Design a protein around this motif. Structure first.
Motif, PDB file in Angstrom:
ATOM      1  N   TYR B  17       0.821  -1.206   0.000  1.00 18.17           N
ATOM      2  CA  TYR B  17       0.000   0.000   0.000  1.00 18.17           C
ATOM      3  C   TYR B  17       0.856   1.259   0.000  1.00 18.17           C
ATOM      4  O   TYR B  17       0.405   2.316  -0.449  1.00 18.17           O
ATOM      5  CB  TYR B  17      -0.934  -0.021   1.211  1.00 18.17           C
ATOM      6  CG  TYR B  17      -1.972   1.075   1.238  1.00 18.17           C
ATOM      7  CD1 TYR B  17      -3.180   0.926   0.584  1.00 18.17           C
ATOM      8  CD2 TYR B  17      -1.749   2.253   1.934  1.00 18.17           C
ATOM      9  CE1 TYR B  17      -4.130   1.921   0.608  1.00 18.17           C
ATOM     10  CE2 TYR B  17      -2.694   3.252   1.961  1.00 18.17           C
ATOM     11  CZ  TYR B  17      -3.882   3.081   1.297  1.00 18.17           C
ATOM     12  OH  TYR B  17      -4.828   4.075   1.322  1.00 18.17           O
ATOM     13  N   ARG B  19       2.987   3.693  -1.396  1.00 12.01           N
ATOM     14  CA  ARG B  19       3.521   4.161  -2.667  1.00 12.01           C
ATOM     15  C   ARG B  19       4.709   5.098  -2.501  1.00 12.01           C
ATOM     16  O   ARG B  19       5.421   5.350  -3.478  1.00 12.01           O
ATOM     17  CB  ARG B  19       2.442   4.886  -3.470  1.00 12.01           C
ATOM     18  CG  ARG B  19       1.323   4.013  -3.986  1.00 12.01           C
ATOM     19  CD  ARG B  19       0.267   4.885  -4.631  1.00 12.01           C
ATOM     20  NE  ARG B  19      -0.728   4.121  -5.368  1.00 12.01           N
ATOM     21  CZ  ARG B  19      -1.968   4.537  -5.579  1.00 12.01           C
ATOM     22  NH1 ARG B  19      -2.389   5.707  -5.128  1.00 12.01           N
ATOM     23  NH2 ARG B  19      -2.808   3.761  -6.257  1.00 12.01           N
TER      24      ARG B  19
ATOM     25  N   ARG C   4     -28.663 -13.912 -22.603  1.00 13.17           N
ATOM     26  CA  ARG C   4     -29.525 -12.856 -22.112  1.00 13.17           C
ATOM     27  C   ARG C   4     -29.098 -11.483 -22.592  1.00 13.17           C
ATOM     28  O   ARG C   4     -29.530 -10.490 -22.006  1.00 13.17           O
ATOM     29  CB  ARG C   4     -29.561 -12.853 -20.578  1.00 13.17           C
ATOM     30  CG  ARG C   4     -30.231 -14.050 -19.945  1.00 13.17           C
ATOM     31  CD  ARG C   4     -30.499 -13.806 -18.470  1.00 13.17           C
ATOM     32  NE  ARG C   4     -30.258 -15.002 -17.671  1.00 13.17           N
ATOM     33  CZ  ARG C   4     -31.167 -15.930 -17.409  1.00 13.17           C
ATOM     34  NH1 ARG C   4     -32.411 -15.825 -17.848  1.00 13.17           N
ATOM     35  NH2 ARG C   4     -30.820 -16.994 -16.692  1.00 13.17           N
ATOM     36  N   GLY C   5     -28.250 -11.394 -23.612  1.00 15.73           N
ATOM     37  CA  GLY C   5     -27.735 -10.120 -24.072  1.00 15.73           C
ATOM     38  C   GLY C   5     -28.799  -9.176 -24.589  1.00 15.73           C
ATOM     39  O   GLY C   5     -29.752  -9.615 -25.235  1.00 15.73           O
ATOM     40  N   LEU C   6     -28.652  -7.880 -24.312  1.00 11.25           N
ATOM     41  CA  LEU C   6     -29.674  -6.912 -24.687  1.00 11.25           C
ATOM     42  C   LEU C   6     -29.725  -6.676 -26.187  1.00 11.25           C
ATOM     43  O   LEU C   6     -30.699  -6.106 -26.685  1.00 11.25           O
ATOM     44  CB  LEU C   6     -29.430  -5.592 -23.964  1.00 11.25           C
ATOM     45  CG  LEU C   6     -30.630  -4.660 -23.826  1.00 11.25           C
ATOM     46  CD1 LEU C   6     -31.670  -5.292 -22.941  1.00 11.25           C
ATOM     47  CD2 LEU C   6     -30.216  -3.318 -23.282  1.00 11.25           C
TER      48      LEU C   6
ATOM     49  N   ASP D  53     -10.159   0.557   1.815  1.00  4.78           N
ATOM     50  CA  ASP D  53      -9.423   1.179   0.719  1.00  4.78           C
ATOM     51  C   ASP D  53      -8.029   0.567   0.626  1.00  4.78           C
ATOM     52  O   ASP D  53      -7.122   0.945   1.370  1.00  4.78           O
ATOM     53  CB  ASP D  53      -9.344   2.689   0.926  1.00  4.78           C
ATOM     54  CG  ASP D  53      -9.018   3.448  -0.348  1.00  4.78           C
ATOM     55  OD1 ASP D  53      -8.668   2.817  -1.362  1.00  4.78           O
ATOM     56  OD2 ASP D  53      -9.107   4.691  -0.334  1.00  4.78           O
ATOM     57  N   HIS D  55      -5.302   0.157  -2.776  1.00  8.92           N
ATOM     58  CA  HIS D  55      -5.095   0.999  -3.948  1.00  8.92           C
ATOM     59  C   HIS D  55      -5.588   0.356  -5.238  1.00  8.92           C
ATOM     60  O   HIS D  55      -5.281   0.838  -6.332  1.00  8.92           O
ATOM     61  CB  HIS D  55      -3.620   1.373  -4.063  1.00  8.92           C
ATOM     62  CG  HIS D  55      -3.196   2.432  -3.096  1.00  8.92           C
ATOM     63  ND1 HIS D  55      -3.917   3.588  -2.898  1.00  8.92           N
ATOM     64  CD2 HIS D  55      -2.122   2.513  -2.276  1.00  8.92           C
ATOM     65  CE1 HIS D  55      -3.308   4.334  -1.994  1.00  8.92           C
ATOM     66  NE2 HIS D  55      -2.216   3.706  -1.603  1.00  8.92           N
ATOM     67  N   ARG D  56      -6.365  -0.703  -5.102  1.00  6.43           N
ATOM     68  CA  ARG D  56      -7.092  -1.426  -6.125  1.00  6.43           C
ATOM     69  C   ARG D  56      -8.568  -1.069  -5.972  1.00  6.43           C
ATOM     70  O   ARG D  56      -8.924  -0.136  -5.250  1.00  6.43           O
ATOM     71  CB  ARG D  56      -6.840  -2.924  -5.971  1.00  6.43           C
ATOM     72  CG  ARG D  56      -5.627  -3.458  -6.687  1.00  6.43           C
ATOM     73  CD  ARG D  56      -4.296  -3.100  -6.065  1.00  6.43           C
ATOM     74  NE  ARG D  56      -4.109  -3.552  -4.697  1.00  6.43           N
ATOM     75  CZ  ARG D  56      -3.076  -3.194  -3.947  1.00  6.43           C
ATOM     76  NH1 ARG D  56      -2.079  -2.484  -4.444  1.00  6.43           N
ATOM     77  NH2 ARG D  56      -3.044  -3.549  -2.668  1.00  6.43           N
ATOM     78  N   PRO D  76     -29.974  -8.360 -18.203  1.00  8.39           N
ATOM     79  CA  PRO D  76     -29.349  -7.053 -18.396  1.00  8.39           C
ATOM     80  C   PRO D  76     -30.204  -5.916 -17.892  1.00  8.39           C
ATOM     81  O   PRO D  76     -31.350  -6.124 -17.529  1.00  8.39           O
ATOM     82  CB  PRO D  76     -29.192  -6.969 -19.908  1.00  8.39           C
ATOM     83  CG  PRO D  76     -30.314  -7.744 -20.423  1.00  8.39           C
ATOM     84  CD  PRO D  76     -30.539  -8.870 -19.459  1.00  8.39           C
ATOM     85  N   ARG D  77     -29.635  -4.716 -17.876  1.00  9.48           N
ATOM     86  CA  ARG D  77     -30.310  -3.542 -17.336  1.00  9.48           C
ATOM     87  C   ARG D  77     -31.367  -3.092 -18.336  1.00  9.48           C
ATOM     88  O   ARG D  77     -31.113  -2.320 -19.262  1.00  9.48           O
ATOM     89  CB  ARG D  77     -29.296  -2.451 -17.042  1.00  9.48           C
ATOM     90  CG  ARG D  77     -28.569  -2.666 -15.749  1.00  9.48           C
ATOM     91  CD  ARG D  77     -27.280  -1.894 -15.709  1.00  9.48           C
ATOM     92  NE  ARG D  77     -26.253  -2.642 -14.998  1.00  9.48           N
ATOM     93  CZ  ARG D  77     -25.231  -2.090 -14.366  1.00  9.48           C
ATOM     94  NH1 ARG D  77     -25.055  -0.783 -14.349  1.00  9.48           N
ATOM     95  NH2 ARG D  77     -24.359  -2.873 -13.741  1.00  9.48           N
ATOM     96  N   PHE D  78     -32.577  -3.603 -18.146  1.00 13.04           N
ATOM     97  CA  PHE D  78     -33.655  -3.336 -19.085  1.00 13.04           C
ATOM     98  C   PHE D  78     -34.131  -1.898 -18.960  1.00 13.04           C
ATOM     99  O   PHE D  78     -34.149  -1.327 -17.869  1.00 13.04           O
ATOM    100  CB  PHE D  78     -34.818  -4.291 -18.832  1.00 13.04           C
ATOM    101  CG  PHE D  78     -34.532  -5.701 -19.228  1.00 13.04           C
ATOM    102  CD1 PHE D  78     -34.410  -6.047 -20.556  1.00 13.04           C
ATOM    103  CD2 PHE D  78     -34.381  -6.683 -18.269  1.00 13.04           C
ATOM    104  CE1 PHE D  78     -34.145  -7.341 -20.919  1.00 13.04           C
ATOM    105  CE2 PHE D  78     -34.113  -7.978 -18.626  1.00 13.04           C
ATOM    106  CZ  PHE D  78     -33.998  -8.308 -19.954  1.00 13.04           C
TER     107      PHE D  78
ATOM    108  N   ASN E  99     -38.138  -7.925 -25.446  1.00 11.65           N
ATOM    109  CA  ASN E  99     -37.640  -6.668 -24.885  1.00 11.65           C
ATOM    110  C   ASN E  99     -36.177  -6.428 -25.219  1.00 11.65           C
ATOM    111  O   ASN E  99     -35.426  -5.923 -24.387  1.00 11.65           O
ATOM    112  CB  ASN E  99     -37.838  -6.580 -23.368  1.00 11.65           C
ATOM    113  CG  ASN E  99     -39.166  -7.111 -22.922  1.00 11.65           C
ATOM    114  OD1 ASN E  99     -39.255  -8.214 -22.394  1.00 11.65           O
ATOM    115  ND2 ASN E  99     -40.213  -6.326 -23.125  1.00 11.65           N
TER     116      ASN E  99
END
Lengths: 262, 149, 141, 129, 151
Positions: B17, B19, C4-6, D53, D55-56, D76-78, E99
């Motif tokens: 960590y 740096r 399931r691809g949009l 936290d 650093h990744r 998917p995000r419909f 959809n």
RNA sequence: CGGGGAAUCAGGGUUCGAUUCCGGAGAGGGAGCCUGAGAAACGGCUACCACAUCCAAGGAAGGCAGCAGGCGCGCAAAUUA
RNA sequence: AAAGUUGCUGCAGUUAAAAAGCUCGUAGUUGGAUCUCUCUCGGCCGAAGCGUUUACUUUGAAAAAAUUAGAGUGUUCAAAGCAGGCCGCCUGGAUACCGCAGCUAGGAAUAAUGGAAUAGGACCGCGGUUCUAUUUUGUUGGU
């Protein structure tokens, strides 16, 4: 088809005529004239369906061709003659005068007017052009051509014109803050003051109008008819003053009217 | 898991960590950069440069002490090879296996490994040509292999 | 697993189209060969001319001898074998009578009792077998 | 490979809470994960969480409570227009009282009630009841 | 003269090339006046049309067309015809059963005026609708922008 | 023939829409015209193809996918008011 | 329709229908984390460049009736209809929905996309070269 049509089916008729389904298969089919087919009230529907002097179309013909009905001061005996917005109907035998203007629901109201108000009408200017030998002409919304108009009169302005002679007597500009009535679209029949006109070049302008109760609605520029200068209309208005009530307040008003009488 | 080996190891390097450069390192960023310069003059790849700097000169990470990683340092003064070191090592491995195949024809395992190496070469060349490190006309040919070494 | 691809609507549509073609009811109703080979021509009833009278043996666990009519259909000339409700109703049927025939009742399938018959006689000489068997109407000749 | 880290975070939370655990460690962190967990937190479902936290991409330790039955992602995000919410909730939430479709809208990360209140739609992320 | 490459004499119909002028004007400068106009929708008439020499009756700025109707865009795909190019418009079509979306395309043949030089394959073109100019062309190039990845 | 639309219905869907409203197409099959603002019109004309009516054998006339009605077809559909 | 036996919602594939000898291997599909409005002319404002472009979402306009949902109304009830009601008068003939695409004006989370690393990169001023001012040389010839 092979040529122009002469018939109008009754279900294909304009809905604001308020015809029913079972009287016939046909509707009265307006003649060619100063108004569009979809934006007019033919004389047979006025004299029979609305005003109820006649019970049949044959009685309408008997009334009309005794030369009793004037439209804009001219005697018409065509029973399907297309009368439309701001047109003055005069029956001298019964002493009645009318203007065809819209209800708040988009239907031509039976609006009775004073015989001095039947001397004139308002027209929306649809085109200005200069013809031969440098003579300026305007064309209105009811197919009227007037030569030598005022140089200040432009398209979308409203002329106040005298039916006895046909000349320009006064005019009103299109300006933000003038009173207007909506003659097309979803806001047909509403009245208010113009508050903002936004311009879309190559497309339709959108005019924003504010009601006297503070409601605001937009229309196209084609649907705007300027009626009065600033705030006071230059013609008589119907019982509703362009104020579209919603269904709730209309039910409340109906219930209060039923409670007060009965 | 690996691309083609089904085994999935974990052994790698775990950067701390911290740096910041540690206090005990008295070498400056400049002295590190001329160390990189002599190391590149000795014919060293950037990986070998970093390994020698870590093992002997005490430089934990060149990017932490100099602000840039080693290939950009070699690229600033032009001491960088034309093609990257991983592609160079795949190509050398391909030449070695191909020469062994020329001596030994019954080694079908070396043929299969050659196919695997060439597949890596093609995928990584596609990646580099996407990011303009290689010119768009560059192609690996089996006969055009010993000339690149 | 399924995708399931949009942006995979075209693949989903194409796959569902082929896999609908693997459905036997869909294939019968849409390929068309079921209606070209059907003796009724896809209709509910058919008229025919009675060619002969035969006897078809019933199934093995319930042994009996049922009596059938061999009839050639009018509109396509196809031969079928039609069932008569009992042996009393068969006495109303003669060779060369115009007969109206329906299906047996399990939608194109044969009988669970009589092997290989799918049609039943409904009318003969423009009167129903129910009206003849109950004495309601008589048939001409 | 590891796609849709929100899916993996929600699966880890669900699996840990069905085993009756008190804390769950999820890696890697994401801003969408943090906003989703904040949406759960404001409704009192996952206690309070903390971001670790390195650093990744960081880690999150979440103090589980027990009120949650299932949290899930909709992949998917419909596109969810403002009418479709009723349809979507009648597909997703087992009842009219508890359960939440989380939407990413132009007004940020919210649940379906606050989506209705601000009069907007967006894309569907998940649900928790 | 890089202009009269046809079997008839190419000229702009609105400009007159036979004005009777004095000797001093003859020795002054031999430049023809050029007809041009604006495609007025916020579209700027390019300098290569105003100061150019070409003759194109189907050019928006110097020809005999008017731009009215739709305004669309495309990516240039083929440029093998004479004063016309073939562009491609990509879009997503929504299948509402699933959809989901599928990617569809339309090929469009548009007239390219000579005032647009250095038009490459993959540059974004803005076209405006005109009257029918041939059997398959109805749109007319009004703007070109380069691809964002190209310097 | 296409739509408006219909059956089902938690939702997505699935099946139906020859058919009275709107748009198109056709008048046995093709093709070509005249007149007119408007037709490539068929309750207009001119040919050919397929059918077909009268005849004194030279000639003449034809077009119900209008309302009724008939034959045929068929499981399948009304009165020459 | 029951039917989740065509499955997007929402099915299955050890032993019942069914997963390929194994690895490499186009396209397509899918892809870790990360980045919180202004300049000119005209009356605090209007015009203008937009801000990378999208996809997405919302608003506004515009969008035949009939049918469907639905408001009113004792067709003797109802299916209907668009009527009616009060002692000449008073009223109705609402309203909703109207996919997608296209116009309109906002939003900036999500997901692409681009902007300087051989620096011929921004912001300023000093500039030099070429083309170029429509007018401030009363009327004019003008190098």
């Amino acid at each position: 088809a092979r040529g122009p049509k002469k018939h109008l089916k009754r279900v294909a008729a304009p809905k604001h005529w308020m015809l029913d389904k079972l009287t016939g298969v046909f509707a009265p089919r307006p003649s060619t004239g100063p108004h569009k087919l979809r934006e007019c009230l033919p004389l047979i529907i006025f004299l029979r369906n609305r005003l109820k002097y006649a019970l049949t179309g044959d009685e309408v013909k008997k009334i009309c061709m005794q030369r009793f009905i004037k439209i804009d001061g001219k005697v018409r005996t065509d029973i399907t003659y297309p009368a439309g917005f701001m047109d003055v109907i005069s029956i001298d035998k019964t002493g009645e005068n009318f203007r065809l203007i819209y209800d708040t629901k988009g239907r031509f109201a039976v609006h009775r007017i004073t015989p001095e108000e039947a001397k004139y009408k308002l027209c929306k200017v649809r085109k200005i052009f200069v013809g031969t030998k440098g003579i300026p002409h305007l064309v209105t919304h009811d197919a009227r051509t007037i030569r030598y108009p005022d140089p200040l009169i432009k398209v979308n302005d409203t002329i106040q014109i005298d039916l006895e002679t046909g000349k320009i007597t006064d005019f009103i500009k299109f300006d933000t803050g003038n009173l207007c009535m909506v003659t097309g679209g979803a806001n047909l029949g509403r009245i208010g003051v113009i508050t903002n006109r936004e311009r879309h070049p190559g497309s339709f302008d959108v005019v924003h109008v504010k009601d006297a109760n503070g409601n605001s609605f937009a229309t196209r520029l084609s649907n705007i008819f300027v009626i009065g200068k600033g705030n006071k209309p230059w013609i008589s208005l119907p019982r509703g003053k362009g104020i579209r009530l919603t269904i709730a307040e209309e039910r409340d008003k109906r219930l209060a009217a039923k409670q007060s009488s009965g | 898991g690996r691309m083609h080996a089904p085994g999935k190891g974990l052994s790698q390097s775990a950067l701390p960590y911290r740096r910041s450069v540690p206090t005990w390192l008295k070498l400056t960023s400049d002295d590190v950069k001329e160390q990189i310069y002599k190391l590149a003059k000795k014919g060293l790849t950037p990986s070998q440069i970093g390994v020698i700097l870590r093992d002997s000169h005490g430089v934990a990470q060149v990017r932490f002490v100099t602000g840039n990683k080693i290939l950009r340092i070699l690229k600033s003064k032009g001491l960088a090879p034309d093609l990257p070191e991983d592609l160079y090592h795949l190509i050398k491995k391909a030449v070695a296996v191909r020469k062994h195949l020329e001596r030994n024809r019954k080694d079908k395992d070396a043929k299969f490994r050659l196919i695997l190496i060439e597949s890596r070469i093609h995928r990584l060349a596609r990646y580099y040509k996407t990011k303009r490190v290689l010119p768009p006309n560059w192609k690996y040919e089996s006969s055009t292999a010993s000339a690149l070494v | 697993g399924k995708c399931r691809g949009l942006r995979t609507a075209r693949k989903l549509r194409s796959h569902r189209r082929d896999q609908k073609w693997h459905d036997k009811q869909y294939k019968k109703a849409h390929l068309g060969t079921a209606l070209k080979a059907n003796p009724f021509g896809g209709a509910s009833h058919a008229k025919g001319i009675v060619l002969e009278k035969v006897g078809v043996e019933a199934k093995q666990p319930n042994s009996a001898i049922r009596k059938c009519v061999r009839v050639q259909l009018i509109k396509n000339g196809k031969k079928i074998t039609a069932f008569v409700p009992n042996d009393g109703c068969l006495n109303f049927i003669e060779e060369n009578d115009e007969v109206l025939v329906a299906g047996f009742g399990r939608k194109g399938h044969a009988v669970g009792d009589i092997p290989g018959v799918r049609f039943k006689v409904v009318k003969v000489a423009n009167v129903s077998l129910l009206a003849l068997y109950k004495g309601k109407k008589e048939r001409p000749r | 490979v590891r796609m849709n880290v929100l899916a993996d975070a929600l699966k880890s939370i669900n699996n840990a809470e069905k085993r009756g655990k008190r804390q769950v460690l999820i890696r890697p962190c994401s801003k969408v994960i943090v906003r989703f967990l904040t949406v759960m937190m404001k409704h009192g479902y996952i206690g309070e969480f903390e971001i670790i936290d390195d650093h990744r991409a960081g880690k999150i330790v979440v103090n589980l409570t027990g009120r949650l039955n299932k949290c899930g992602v909709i992949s998917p995000r419909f596109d969810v227009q403002l009418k479709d919410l009723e349809k979507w909730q009648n597909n997703l939430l087992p009842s009219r009282q508890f359960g939440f479709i989380v939407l990413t809208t132009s007004a940020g990360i919210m649940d379906h009630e606050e989506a209705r209140r601000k009069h907007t739609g967006g894309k569907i992320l998940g649900f928790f009841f | 003269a890089d202009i009269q490459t046809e079997r008839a004499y190419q000229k702009q119909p609105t400009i007159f090339q036979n004005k009777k002028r004095v000797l001093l004007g003859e020795t002054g400068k031999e430049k023809l006046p050029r007809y041009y106009k604006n495609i007025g929708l916020g579209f700027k008439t390019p300098k290569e049309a105003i100061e150019g020499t070409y003759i194109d009756k189907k050019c928006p700025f110097t020809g005999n067309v008017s731009i009215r109707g739709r305004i669309l865009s495309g990516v240039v795909t083929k440029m093998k015809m004479q004063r016309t190019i073939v562009i491609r418009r990509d879009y997503l079509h929504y299948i509402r059963k699933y959809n989901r979306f599928e990617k569809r395309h339309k090929n469009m043949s548009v007239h390219l005026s000579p005032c647009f030089r250095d038009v490459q394959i993959g540059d974004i073109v803005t076209v405006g609708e005109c009257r029918p100019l041939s059997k398959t062309v109805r749109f007319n190039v009004l703007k070109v922008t380069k691809a964002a990845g190209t310097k």
